[PDB]
Design a protein around this ligand. Structure first.
Ligand SMILES: [Mg+2]
Ligand SMILES: [Mg+2]
Ligand SMILES: [Mg+2]
Ligand SMILES: [Mg+2]
Ligand SMILES: [Mg+2]
Ligand SMILES: [Mg+2]
Ligand SMILES: [Mg+2]
Lengths: 95, 287, 152, 110, 54, 52
RNA sequence: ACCUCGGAGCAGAACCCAACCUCCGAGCAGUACAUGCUAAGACUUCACCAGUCAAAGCGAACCUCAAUUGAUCCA
């Protein structure tokens, strides 16, 4: 994944991860379901409703994506009207 | 202390007596010996022991997880979105109470940074400070503050104690200049004129409800009265105040600093200020 | 001192006064709907920190002269479930954790009650979720009323 | 960092309060951070270990340990788990007690 | 009933309310795998923005 | 044999939905719920794109 | 000769369980067009991806079938 670049000696990031996933500052990664816009004419409304969901990733997948991205994508952002602003923090979680 | 009394004995400290704190220096593990050699932690043959293991994200040939998922514009224009550092009312009250930024003078971005209540990053796309209502109650400050964004509850809370809040705009260059003025002064450049807000921020900063710095002051009292009526706590008249002159300082647009004007040059050594006559320069720096 | 071509005086030549943005329109904005805050007792007391402060506004409804006589009686009739022993109307708010917003909601409740009881020709929309059972019970109750003589 | 101004009545809004003069007659002493706060900090190493750190202790620290145990035993129902560091005069406590310890030390006048 | 409480029992009238048990949610996971984005909404107390140290 | 067609409403314009239709049968006019007007309106088959 | 999916046995009574093992099948079809929208709590083909069920609620009347299938990019 180019741990060391030939120009700066820096770690690089896989841009497919950035194009496909969103990282909340707590450490959670959000993805879209596969096939959520393919052949909707053979799918039931419940299946399509569960396909339209934004879902969380595994612990293993989260660590893999953290390895595949650089620390720039893990900083705390303060956008103006972020629809995911309230999801960047964890509440009432115990160990 | 008993420690120096102990040291009164205890032969003198030299370079032959030094020793690290236990736990700081973890011991290195070398591949020599029976336990750590003969395979050196690599296991038996295959790609593992030979080091030619496939790249991270590869899953043996099956379509990987990070490619199976459909693309979605989560971080589409992330480098162009604007960001604002939150400044809470309770943090502002704490700053005021601890001898930091002084309410007796207008409070703006440079004052907040010099008091070190906020750290603004012009790179990483921060457009200033946004005011939030975390400490709306138990907030007795009486300040004249200038921010870039503010909630209506924060506006009500500040206006409620006899203070004035206004909402201004800064382009990234003026943001850097106003956050770190001293490096700009050492740069040697004449003070530029602050730029107007973008076409989408124009209706925000020309709206008297957000206390925008480009809105007509003929609608400020009615909006202040409306906020006071919505939230109780009748609106105080600040014209009869002893600090009304200080509260009135408004810091004209295209003027990044208070007493300074665009086009001036600051000479920090041999302290003085240079003014650009040849009135073509005046026309450029005023228009 | 410095003024650019975007100075406020040139942007809005009519509003050139020094105190034009701070003068209070108390002379004209003195209608009967101002809800004099002095005559409302507002208490801020519920054990916050469940982090939701409580707004409690109470006022003697009978002696509320700022509300007209017929709307006052209509409010007393239609909100009799909120009148304490001493006759004062009680309104509370829990929507937010800011006492500012809680008081705002209480004041909005007061204004809505006043301006709803003022306009009596409002048409009550029918509901059949909770009161259908009550009305059927009342009908089958009134069905049992038939002698000739009784008093008190 | 400027010295905080002389307020007429304490505690100030936001709950700040200066240390009292003269210093309390105690076997130990707890200095204030450079910004005049109580040096009690939350700490989390793993995803589980919640601890509090009382950092700028000066004098003997075993008396402070005794006082902290006597203060937090009723609140916990058991004696608190504690580590003493004399060389770096800090006191580590298992669990989150930052606000309780800040109020307690303020009441003792540090 | 309210005037009975007014002048007969010379007491302040009590009012009751039929409440229900709080909804059951499982123990919150650090990684809620395959749960919708609204999973995090079942564990908040106040639905208002928070800014911790800022 | 059976063809998937697109059905477009008249009122609540812009809302379409795909349904399976036998090829030999005439074009469909159906009552269907239109969420942008929150009531059942007519839908007329237009622009068939599928063959199953 | 086979490569994907489902039913039965082997595999007798929670689950799982191989075989170039024994046998059947599938790559559709038919009917409404609320086959609308949301949302607790669960199951899960031993991972993941996929897949499955569903209270309450908002609206509106007062679903059969076993498999019947194809990710991403891109168009
Ligand atoms: Mg050997
Ligand atoms: Mg070998
Ligand atoms: Mg091998
Ligand atoms: Mg292949
Ligand atoms: Mg730590
Ligand atoms: Mg499973
Ligand atoms: Mg239902």
């Amino acid at each position: 994944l180019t741990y060391f670049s030939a120009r700066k000696g820096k770690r690089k990031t896989v841009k497919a991860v950035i194009d496909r996933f969103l990282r909340l500052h707590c450490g959670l990664w959000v993805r879209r379901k596969a096939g959520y816009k393919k052949k909707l004419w053979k799918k039931t409304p419940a299946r399509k409703k569960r396909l339209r969901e934004f879902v969380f990733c595994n612990k293993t997948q989260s660590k893999l994506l953290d390895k595949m991205t650089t620390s720039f994508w893990k900083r705390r952002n303060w956008y103006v009207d972020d629809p995911y602003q309230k999801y960047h923090d964890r509440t009432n979680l115990k160990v | 202390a008993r420690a120096l009394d102990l040291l009164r004995g205890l032969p003198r400290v030299s370079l032959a007596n030094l020793k690290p704190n236990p736990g700081s220096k973890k011991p290195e593990r070398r591949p020599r010996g029976r336990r750590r050699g003969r395979k050196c932690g690599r296991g038996h043959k295959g790609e593992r022991q030979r080091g030619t293991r496939p790249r991270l994200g590869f899953e043996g040939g099956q379509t990987p997880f990070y490619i199976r998922i459909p693309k979605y514009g989560f971080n589409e224009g992330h480098s162009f979105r604007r960001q604002y550092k939150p400044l809470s009312l309770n943090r502002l009250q704490y700053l005021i109470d601890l001898g930091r930024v002084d309410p007796s003078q207008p409070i703006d971005l440079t004052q907040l940074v010099n008091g070190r209540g906020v750290t603004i990053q012009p790179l990483k796309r921060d457009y200033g400070v946004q005011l939030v209502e975390e400490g709306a109650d138990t907030f007795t400050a009486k300040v004249n503050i200038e921010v870039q964004l503010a909630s209506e509850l924060a506006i009500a809370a500040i206006e409620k104690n006899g203070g004035v809040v206004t909402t201004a705009f800064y382009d990234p260059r003026s943001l850097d200049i106003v956050c770190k003025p001293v490096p700009f002064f050492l740069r040697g450049q004449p003070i530029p004129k602050r730029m107007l807000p973008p076409e989408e921020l124009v209706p925000y900063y020309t709206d008297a409800k957000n206390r925008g710095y480009l809105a007509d002051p003929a609608k400020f009292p009615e909006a202040r009265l409306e906020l006071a009526r919505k939230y109780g706590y009748i609106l105080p008249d600040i014209t009869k105040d002893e600090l009304f002159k200080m509260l009135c300082t408004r810091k004209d647009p295209r003027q990044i600093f208070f007493g300074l004007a665009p086009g001036w040059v600051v000479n920090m050594a041999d302290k003085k200020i240079l003014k650009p006559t040849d009135e073509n320069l005046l026309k450029y720096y005023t228009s | 001192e410095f003024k650019s071509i975007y100075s406020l005086d040139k942007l809005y030549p009519e509003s050139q006064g020094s105190d034009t943005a701070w003068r209070v329109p108390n002379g004209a904005k003195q209608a009967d709907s101002d809800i004099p805050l002095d005559r409302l007792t507002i208490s801020y007391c519920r054990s916050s920190g469940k982090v939701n402060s409580k707004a409690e506004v109470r006022f003697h409804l009978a002696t509320a002269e700022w509300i007209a006589e017929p709307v006052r009686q209509k409010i007393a009739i239609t909100h009799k479930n909120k009148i304490n022993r001493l006759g004062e109307l009680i309104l509370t708010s829990e929507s937010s954790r800011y006492q500012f917003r809680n008081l705002a909601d209480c004041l909005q409740k007061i204004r809505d009650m006043i301006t709803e009881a003022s306009q009596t020709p409002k048409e009550p929309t029918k509901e059949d979720v909770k009161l259908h059972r009550i009305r059927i019970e009342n009908m089958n109750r009134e069905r049992l009323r038939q002698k000739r003589i009784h008093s008190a | 960092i400027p010295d905080p101004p002389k307020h007429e009545h304490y505690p100030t809004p936001s709950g700040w309060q200066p240390p009292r003069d003269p210093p309390p007659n105690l076997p130990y002493f707890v200095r204030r951070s450079r910004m005049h706060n109580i040096p009690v900090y939350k700490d989390i190493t793993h995803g589980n270990r919640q601890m509090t750190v009382i950092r700028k202790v000066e004098g003997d620290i075993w008396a402070l340990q005794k006082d902290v145990e006597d203060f937090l035993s009723p609140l916990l129902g058991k004696t608190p788990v504690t580590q003493v560091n004399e060389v770096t005069g800090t006191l580590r406590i298992k669990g989150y007690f930052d606000q309780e310890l800040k109020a307690w030390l303020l009441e003792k006048g540090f | 009933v309210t005037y009975i409480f007014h002048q007969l029992l010379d007491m302040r009238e009590p009012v009751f309310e039929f409440v229900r048990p709080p909804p059951y949610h499982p123990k919150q996971k650090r990684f809620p795998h395959r749960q919708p984005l609204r999973y995090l909404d079942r564990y908040r107390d106040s639905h208002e923005p928070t800014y911790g140290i800022y | 044999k059976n063809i998937l067609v697109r059905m477009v409403s008249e009122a609540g314009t812009g809302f379409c939905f795909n349904t399976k239709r036998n090829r030999l049968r005439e074009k469909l006019t159906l009552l269907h719920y239109d969420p942008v007007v929150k009531q059942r309106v007519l839908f007329v088959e237009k622009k068939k794109i599928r063959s199953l």
